[PDB]
Amino acid sequence: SWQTYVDDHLMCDVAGNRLTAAAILGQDGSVWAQSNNFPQVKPEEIQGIKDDFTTPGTLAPTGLFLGGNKYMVIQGEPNAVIRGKKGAGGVTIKKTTLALVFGIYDEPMTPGQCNMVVENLGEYLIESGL
């Protein structure tokens, strides 16, 4: 089940902290699994994310919007990881073979903790061909 990846491997404890929300979306924008408080992402938001993976610099001028919430784009990895910041909270998006893995964090979870849980699950999925 895609939902087990979210429940057990994104919404798990990391050094005492936990993501606020998480999801796995197809690269078509459809939700394959999500936590309860994960926002409804708009099609144009998904389009900007997909474009930024293959064309870095797409999202930085406008910011990264997730369910209408604006995140400022910060350091990522081309065609692999998008990272955004909103005060002491933020978001990490990891591109896999078929899907996009999202984690949204709030204080006191650190950006490094969010990156670890999201990117490690994404790398597991890539090894599965997913």
PDB file of C-alpha atoms in Angstrom:
ATOM      1  CA  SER A   1       0.000   0.000   0.000  1.00  0.00           C
ATOM      2  CA  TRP A   2       1.252   3.498  -0.763  1.00  0.00           C
ATOM      3  CA  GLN A   3      -0.355   4.610   2.501  1.00  0.00           C
ATOM      4  CA  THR A   4       1.981   2.413   4.547  1.00  0.00           C
ATOM      5  CA  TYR A   5       4.969   4.329   3.179  1.00  0.00           C
ATOM      6  CA  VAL A   6       3.421   7.545   4.496  1.00  0.00           C
ATOM      7  CA  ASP A   7       2.197   6.222   7.834  1.00  0.00           C
ATOM      8  CA  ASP A   8       5.264   4.175   8.789  1.00  0.00           C
ATOM      9  CA  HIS A   9       8.163   5.843   6.948  1.00  0.00           C
ATOM     10  CA  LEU A  10       7.360   9.539   6.635  1.00  0.00           C
ATOM     11  CA  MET A  11       5.198  10.153   9.696  1.00  0.00           C
ATOM     12  CA  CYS A  12       7.606   8.291  11.997  1.00  0.00           C
ATOM     13  CA  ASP A  13       9.603   9.741  14.870  1.00  0.00           C
ATOM     14  CA  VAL A  14      13.008  11.274  14.089  1.00  0.00           C
ATOM     15  CA  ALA A  15      15.110  12.290  17.109  1.00  0.00           C
ATOM     16  CA  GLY A  16      11.891  13.012  18.992  1.00  0.00           C
ATOM     17  CA  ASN A  17      10.220  15.103  16.257  1.00  0.00           C
ATOM     18  CA  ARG A  18       7.632  14.312  13.594  1.00  0.00           C
ATOM     19  CA  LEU A  19       6.595  15.831  10.277  1.00  0.00           C
ATOM     20  CA  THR A  20       3.391  17.837  10.380  1.00  0.00           C
ATOM     21  CA  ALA A  21       2.215  16.297   7.112  1.00  0.00           C
ATOM     22  CA  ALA A  22       3.435  14.130   4.256  1.00  0.00           C
ATOM     23  CA  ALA A  23       2.286  12.682   0.973  1.00  0.00           C
ATOM     24  CA  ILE A  24       3.251  10.683  -2.087  1.00  0.00           C
ATOM     25  CA  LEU A  25       1.864  12.049  -5.366  1.00  0.00           C
ATOM     26  CA  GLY A  26       2.168  10.645  -8.841  1.00  0.00           C
ATOM     27  CA  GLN A  27       4.137  12.784 -11.203  1.00  0.00           C
ATOM     28  CA  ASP A  28       0.672  13.459 -12.659  1.00  0.00           C
ATOM     29  CA  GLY A  29      -0.441  15.236  -9.472  1.00  0.00           C
ATOM     30  CA  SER A  30      -2.785  12.510  -8.236  1.00  0.00           C
ATOM     31  CA  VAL A  31      -2.480  11.662  -4.547  1.00  0.00           C
ATOM     32  CA  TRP A  32      -1.310   8.090  -4.019  1.00  0.00           C
ATOM     33  CA  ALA A  33      -1.093   8.471  -0.233  1.00  0.00           C
ATOM     34  CA  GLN A  34      -1.211  11.303   2.266  1.00  0.00           C
ATOM     35  CA  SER A  35      -1.477  12.173   5.933  1.00  0.00           C
ATOM     36  CA  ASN A  36      -4.642  13.824   7.261  1.00  0.00           C
ATOM     37  CA  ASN A  37      -3.355  17.392   7.433  1.00  0.00           C
ATOM     38  CA  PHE A  38      -1.647  17.328   4.037  1.00  0.00           C
ATOM     39  CA  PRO A  39      -3.099  20.196   1.961  1.00  0.00           C
ATOM     40  CA  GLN A  40      -4.963  19.980  -1.309  1.00  0.00           C
ATOM     41  CA  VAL A  41      -2.350  20.860  -3.938  1.00  0.00           C
ATOM     42  CA  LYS A  42      -3.540  22.765  -7.001  1.00  0.00           C
ATOM     43  CA  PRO A  43      -2.715  21.599 -10.550  1.00  0.00           C
ATOM     44  CA  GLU A  44      -0.699  24.741 -11.294  1.00  0.00           C
ATOM     45  CA  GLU A  45       1.257  24.217  -8.056  1.00  0.00           C
ATOM     46  CA  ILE A  46       2.129  20.673  -9.156  1.00  0.00           C
ATOM     47  CA  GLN A  47       3.061  21.970 -12.612  1.00  0.00           C
ATOM     48  CA  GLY A  48       5.514  24.502 -11.170  1.00  0.00           C
ATOM     49  CA  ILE A  49       7.120  21.779  -9.057  1.00  0.00           C
ATOM     50  CA  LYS A  50       7.524  19.370 -11.982  1.00  0.00           C
ATOM     51  CA  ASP A  51       8.937  22.163 -14.138  1.00  0.00           C
ATOM     52  CA  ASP A  52      11.443  23.202 -11.467  1.00  0.00           C
ATOM     53  CA  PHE A  53      12.935  19.705 -11.288  1.00  0.00           C
ATOM     54  CA  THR A  54      13.915  19.730 -14.964  1.00  0.00           C
ATOM     55  CA  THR A  55      14.420  23.530 -15.182  1.00  0.00           C
ATOM     56  CA  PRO A  56      16.001  24.929 -12.010  1.00  0.00           C
ATOM     57  CA  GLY A  57      15.121  28.557 -11.335  1.00  0.00           C
ATOM     58  CA  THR A  58      11.450  28.134 -12.279  1.00  0.00           C
ATOM     59  CA  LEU A  59      10.063  28.411  -8.733  1.00  0.00           C
ATOM     60  CA  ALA A  60      12.552  30.767  -7.076  1.00  0.00           C
ATOM     61  CA  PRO A  61      11.088  34.038  -8.510  1.00  0.00           C
ATOM     62  CA  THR A  62       7.500  33.302  -7.438  1.00  0.00           C
ATOM     63  CA  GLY A  63       7.980  31.109  -4.390  1.00  0.00           C
ATOM     64  CA  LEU A  64       6.689  27.602  -3.816  1.00  0.00           C
ATOM     65  CA  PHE A  65       2.945  27.360  -3.186  1.00  0.00           C
ATOM     66  CA  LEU A  66       1.393  24.319  -1.483  1.00  0.00           C
ATOM     67  CA  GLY A  67      -2.343  24.543  -0.939  1.00  0.00           C
ATOM     68  CA  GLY A  68      -2.056  28.322  -1.203  1.00  0.00           C
ATOM     69  CA  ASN A  69       0.712  28.539   1.427  1.00  0.00           C
ATOM     70  CA  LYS A  70       3.818  30.336   0.174  1.00  0.00           C
ATOM     71  CA  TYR A  71       7.266  28.872   0.901  1.00  0.00           C
ATOM     72  CA  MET A  72      10.479  30.583  -0.090  1.00  0.00           C
ATOM     73  CA  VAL A  73      12.627  28.322  -2.252  1.00  0.00           C
ATOM     74  CA  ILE A  74      15.966  27.395  -0.684  1.00  0.00           C
ATOM     75  CA  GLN A  75      18.882  25.110  -1.570  1.00  0.00           C
ATOM     76  CA  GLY A  76      17.918  21.897  -3.358  1.00  0.00           C
ATOM     77  CA  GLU A  77      19.432  19.336  -5.735  1.00  0.00           C
ATOM     78  CA  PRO A  78      18.741  19.610  -9.493  1.00  0.00           C
ATOM     79  CA  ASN A  79      16.132  17.165 -10.766  1.00  0.00           C
ATOM     80  CA  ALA A  80      16.102  15.495  -7.340  1.00  0.00           C
ATOM     81  CA  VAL A  81      15.112  17.645  -4.341  1.00  0.00           C
ATOM     82  CA  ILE A  82      13.155  20.880  -3.909  1.00  0.00           C
ATOM     83  CA  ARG A  83      13.284  22.582  -0.503  1.00  0.00           C
ATOM     84  CA  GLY A  84      11.212  25.468   0.806  1.00  0.00           C
ATOM     85  CA  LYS A  85      11.150  27.482   3.999  1.00  0.00           C
ATOM     86  CA  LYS A  86       8.294  29.236   5.818  1.00  0.00           C
ATOM     87  CA  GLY A  87       9.715  30.780   8.972  1.00  0.00           C
ATOM     88  CA  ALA A  88      10.882  27.960  11.238  1.00  0.00           C
ATOM     89  CA  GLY A  89       8.867  25.480   9.169  1.00  0.00           C
ATOM     90  CA  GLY A  90       9.407  24.193   5.679  1.00  0.00           C
ATOM     91  CA  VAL A  91       8.946  21.499   3.062  1.00  0.00           C
ATOM     92  CA  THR A  92      11.061  18.938   1.215  1.00  0.00           C
ATOM     93  CA  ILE A  93      10.004  17.382  -2.113  1.00  0.00           C
ATOM     94  CA  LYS A  94      11.936  14.394  -3.466  1.00  0.00           C
ATOM     95  CA  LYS A  95      11.517  13.165  -7.032  1.00  0.00           C
ATOM     96  CA  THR A  96      11.471   9.400  -7.579  1.00  0.00           C
ATOM     97  CA  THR A  97      11.120   7.339 -10.759  1.00  0.00           C
ATOM     98  CA  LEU A  98       7.317   7.580 -10.768  1.00  0.00           C
ATOM     99  CA  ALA A  99       6.333   9.812  -7.867  1.00  0.00           C
ATOM    100  CA  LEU A 100       6.996  12.894  -5.740  1.00  0.00           C
ATOM    101  CA  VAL A 101       7.518  12.519  -1.993  1.00  0.00           C
ATOM    102  CA  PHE A 102       6.517  15.476   0.201  1.00  0.00           C
ATOM    103  CA  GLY A 103       7.242  16.265   3.838  1.00  0.00           C
ATOM    104  CA  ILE A 104       6.076  19.424   5.660  1.00  0.00           C
ATOM    105  CA  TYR A 105       7.693  20.283   9.004  1.00  0.00           C
ATOM    106  CA  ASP A 106       7.215  22.790  11.799  1.00  0.00           C
ATOM    107  CA  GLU A 107       9.287  23.779  14.817  1.00  0.00           C
ATOM    108  CA  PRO A 108      11.051  22.085  16.494  1.00  0.00           C
ATOM    109  CA  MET A 109      11.760  19.645  13.688  1.00  0.00           C
ATOM    110  CA  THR A 110      14.838  20.809  11.780  1.00  0.00           C
ATOM    111  CA  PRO A 111      15.277  21.078   8.001  1.00  0.00           C
ATOM    112  CA  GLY A 112      17.898  18.344   8.248  1.00  0.00           C
ATOM    113  CA  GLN A 113      15.459  15.986   9.942  1.00  0.00           C
ATOM    114  CA  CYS A 114      12.781  16.586   7.290  1.00  0.00           C
ATOM    115  CA  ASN A 115      15.324  16.128   4.495  1.00  0.00           C
ATOM    116  CA  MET A 116      16.507  12.856   6.002  1.00  0.00           C
ATOM    117  CA  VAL A 117      13.093  11.243   6.287  1.00  0.00           C
ATOM    118  CA  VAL A 118      11.847  12.422   2.885  1.00  0.00           C
ATOM    119  CA  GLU A 119      15.027  11.805   0.896  1.00  0.00           C
ATOM    120  CA  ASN A 120      15.718   8.416   2.481  1.00  0.00           C
ATOM    121  CA  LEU A 121      12.220   7.172   1.661  1.00  0.00           C
ATOM    122  CA  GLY A 122      12.552   8.550  -1.859  1.00  0.00           C
ATOM    123  CA  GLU A 123      15.820   6.681  -2.319  1.00  0.00           C
ATOM    124  CA  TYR A 124      14.198   3.467  -1.096  1.00  0.00           C
ATOM    125  CA  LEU A 125      11.419   3.933  -3.642  1.00  0.00           C
ATOM    126  CA  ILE A 126      13.920   4.545  -6.472  1.00  0.00           C
ATOM    127  CA  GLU A 127      15.621   1.229  -5.622  1.00  0.00           C
ATOM    128  CA  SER A 128      12.197  -0.403  -5.976  1.00  0.00           C
ATOM    129  CA  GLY A 129      11.789   1.164  -9.419  1.00  0.00           C
ATOM    130  CA  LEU A 130       9.164   3.567  -8.036  1.00  0.00           C
TER     131      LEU A 130
END
